[PDB]
Every structure is written in C-alpha cells, then in structure tokens.
C-alpha cells in the first residue's frame, strides 16, 4: 500500500471525473469502463463482414460515410495489398500514426491487436498529445499495462482502448461483444511525456521511468480506491 493522493478535478465526461494528480511528474487519472477499439488492427474490417468487427461499425463501405480508415478517389475503403498483413481487408486507421508510412498503408497506423493503447475523448485530451504514455490498471483482476494515447474517441464517451490492452488487463478483447461497461479500469496519463511516434520499446521504457518516479503501481492501487 501507499499513501492516498491529492486530486484536483480538471474535466468530466459521461459522468466520469478526470482529476489532475497533484505533484510530480504531472499526470491525470480517471476510473471508467473499457470499450474495445479495434481501429488500427489490419483484420478489423473487410467486405461482407469478413473482419473481426462488423463492417458497418466503420461506416458505409460502398462509397458512403466511411470513418474506419482511408478511402480511394471514389470513396471506397482502401484494400490492403499483397505486402500488407491481411490482403483484401480494409485499411483501418488510428489518430496516432507513424509518419514513415503512407496514408494508404496499414503500417502507418497503430495495430490494436499488438499495441496497448488508450483512447481519449475528442476535445478532452486534457493536455495529452498522441503518443504520450499512460499506466492502466484493472481493479477487478489486479492486472496492469503501460500504454500510449493512440486514438481519439467520441467527445461524449470515455473509457476505451486496444485489443492488446484488453488482453493485458484480462478484459474480453472481442471487438463485437467484449469490453466492459463496469467502471473498473483506472488510467493514469502522463501528458507531455512523448508527443510523437516512437518505437514501442522506447515509449514503454519511458512509461516505466515515469511510473517509477511517480511511485509505481503501489501508489496507483491506493489511488484507485479514491475514485
């Protein structure tokens, strides 16, 4: 156990209070549910409901409003090539991206299947920039994982992250029926910590260094009981 933390409200979304954690390093925290964001997974979306998510959860794939990823000049989703992970599936995008790759490439986006990432609500980043790191904890399983701020969600919803983060937290990772509405996940974000794409080894190390400086899981576990 650790001492309790001193908390100062900075925001509120969907009945979830977001608190700055007084002290250094600078951080904010919230306790929320955990919806599955399959964005960036190269098998999330395909024609005829072929992906791990239903196609329509990315929008209309017949030239209408498609938000799941990039589109061609006639508005249809880009299909992956023979050198992409899932040829013929659609390219699924995340807000955070790797500039080494082109807009039409799955490799530009953060693969939800492999990378632990959190989503923050649009207009509710609270000073965090895409690529910043976080420590995430599930109070019902005792599991934790470092993660990046990797995607942007609806402004009216909070508590969401990647397939791999769900696995690490022992939350059902299925895009179609997984996640949880129970407010069991505590997310500690370090705004200003990275703010760019870098290798997972590098950002994970930086998350580890910030977490050690901040007081570790022991402090976050105690903090969770305050939320």
Residue numbers in the entry: -2 to 224
Excerpt from the paper describing this PDB structure:
The structure consisted of two non-contiguous structural domains. Our rigorous analyses not only resulted in a crystal structure of a soil viral AMG product, but also enabled us to propose the mode of action of this previously uncharacterized chitosanase enzyme in the GH75 family of glycosyl hydrolases.
The V-Csn structure was solved in two crystal forms; apo1 containing a single molecule in the asymmetric unit, and apo2 containing a dimer in the asymmetric unit. The apo1 structure was solved by single anomalous diffraction (SAD) methods using the signal from bromide ions soaked into crystals of the apo1 form. Refinement was completed with phenix.refine24 against a high resolution apo1 data set extending to 0.89 Å resolution. The final model comprised 1811 protein atoms in a single chain, 398 water molecules, three glycerol and a sulfate anion. The final Rwork and Rfree were 0.1198 and 0.1307 for 174,427 total reflections. The N-terminal part of Domain-1 (residues 1-36) is folded first and the polypeptide then folds the entire Domain-2 (residues 37-108) before crossing back to complete Domain-1 (residues 109-224). Inspection of the apo1 structure shows that the two residues identified as putative active site residues (D148 and E157) are located in a cleft between the two structural domains.
